[PDB]
Design a protein around this ligand. Structure first.
Ligand SMILES: Nc1ncnc2c1ncn2[C@@H]1O[C@H](COP(=O)(O)O[C@H]2[C@@H](O)[C@H](n3cnc4c(N)ncnc43)O[C@@H]2CSCC[C@H](N)C(=O)O)[C@@H](O)[C@H]1O
Ligand SMILES: Nc1ncnc2c1ncn2[C@@H]1O[C@H](COP(=O)(O)O[C@H]2[C@@H](O)[C@H](n3cnc4c(N)ncnc43)O[C@@H]2CSCC[C@H](N)C(=O)O)[C@@H](O)[C@H]1O
Ligand SMILES: Nc1ncnc2c1ncn2[C@@H]1O[C@H](COP(=O)(O)O[C@H]2[C@@H](O)[C@H](n3cnc4c(N)ncnc43)O[C@@H]2CSCC[C@H](N)C(=O)O)[C@@H](O)[C@H]1O
Lengths: 122, 123, 124
């Protein structure tokens, strides 16, 4: 019994001068790789992430483009093989989510935790 | 955990909407969601935003599935306490939107799930 | 209620073995492999485990072998629908069996398979 996280971030096409969904995915992947490595150096907690392309739909009156905004969804699980303290991991995820929000220049960002039963095959 | 998230899975109906990419499929469903979400928001004052992911759904070829799977879209969203006073009314709104999305996409079936989640909202 | 379980599996696509060259092509690769192992299991036990599959990249430390910006992966998910499932525990055992078959067939060294509580509303 453990936790997974899910983060939803915009890609900020204009600030990063990207022009394809795959460039935005490679952008966020590289940014996560850098900040997860830094946090691992500090705390020995490495937060790996599975990143998926997406579009997020909300009201055009509140800033959404027609048909939605390009986004990345990042998800990962606390693996007991690597994580001894679920609370420290969860605090680490929250720090990383805030740092991703800052580096991606996002005005808002969601970070969820969901209970999950992990079967790890090695 | 302290709120709910939903997940809906829908086909993209290339036979009816005559689309031919992952982009035009996300654009189609996203534009449709944006319209039905706004319509429900006007009626109920509950706006349900959605995160839309490209996918394929794999099932038995003898039940209609193409080889390697049917093109689909996965829609997710979370009830944010800053926007949602009443989680049961939000749940009923999501279900109403799911049935409406099924109708607009001309889907024979459609799944809608609710999962408990703990939301941290940074603004 | 509709109280049930969903599974989530994360698999690499093993470009060194299958040599796919795009995300759409590795999605079709994993989709075909799942289709065939789900079919075999359905013929034997009458439990068909469908899967939604999503393209993705998985980010971990390059020190441990991750490519820059992430490794190409596929996420597979599915949910036990009480209209088809007679025994949720047998469904769960079947998912685990299929996940291990997928691991073997994709020649993955490691693979995660999660179960998450969910409430399914099924419209037909
Ligand atoms: N459901 C809502 N009800 C009422 N008001 C809303 C709602 N959504 C947005 N608003 C209003 O719109 C304005 C923007 O608010 P945001 O919170 O940034 O609005 C959100 C949500 O609508 C939606 N969204 C984000 N994460 C999720 C998720 N996990 N699931 C589903 N939808 C998601 O996408 C928007 C952010 S879009 C990506 C972030 C953006 N590039 C940035 O720089 O901030 C603000 O004025 C809000 O009051
Ligand atoms: N698991 C099963 N076991 C036994 N019989 C099944 C099963 N699935 C389908 N059938 C048979 O096929 C008939 C059609 O059933 P459907 O429910 O439409 O079968 C489903 C599921 O097999 C699969 N699927 C849908 N949602 C999900 C999800 N969230 N996770 C995993 N898989 C998903 O994909 C199919 C729908 S595919 C997209 C919808 C379709 N374009 C349409 O217009 O209806 C049904 O009446 C049964 O006879
Ligand atoms: N988080 C970590 N903390 C510490 N050490 C780690 C961590 N991850 C990997 N390592 C080290 O690297 C070695 C390999 O470990 P793996 O378990 O294979 O490392 C994992 C995880 O880091 C990550 N990953 C996989 N599934 C998930 C998921 N659901 N959510 C988030 N991330 C996921 O991706 C890697 C697998 S990449 C795909 C599988 C691979 N092609 C293969 O053939 O095995 C391991 O022995 C450790 O020494």
């Amino acid at each position: 019994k453990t936790l997974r996280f899910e983060i939803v971030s915009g890609v900020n096409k204009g600030y990063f001068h990207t022009n394809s969904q795959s460039e935005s995915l490679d952008l966020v992947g590289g940014i996560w790789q850098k900040i997860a490595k830094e946090e691992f150096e500090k705390s020995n907690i490495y937060v790996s992430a599975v990143i998926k392309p997406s579009k997020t739909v909300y009201n055009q009156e509140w800033g959404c483009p027609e048909n939605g905004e390009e986004t990345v969804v990042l998800t990962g699980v606390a693996n007991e093989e690597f994580v001894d303290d679920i609370e420290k991991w969860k605090d680490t995820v929250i720090k990383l989510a805030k740092e991703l929000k800052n580096q991606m220049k996002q005005s808002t960002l969601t970070c969820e935790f969901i209970e999950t039963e992990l079967h790890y095959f090695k």
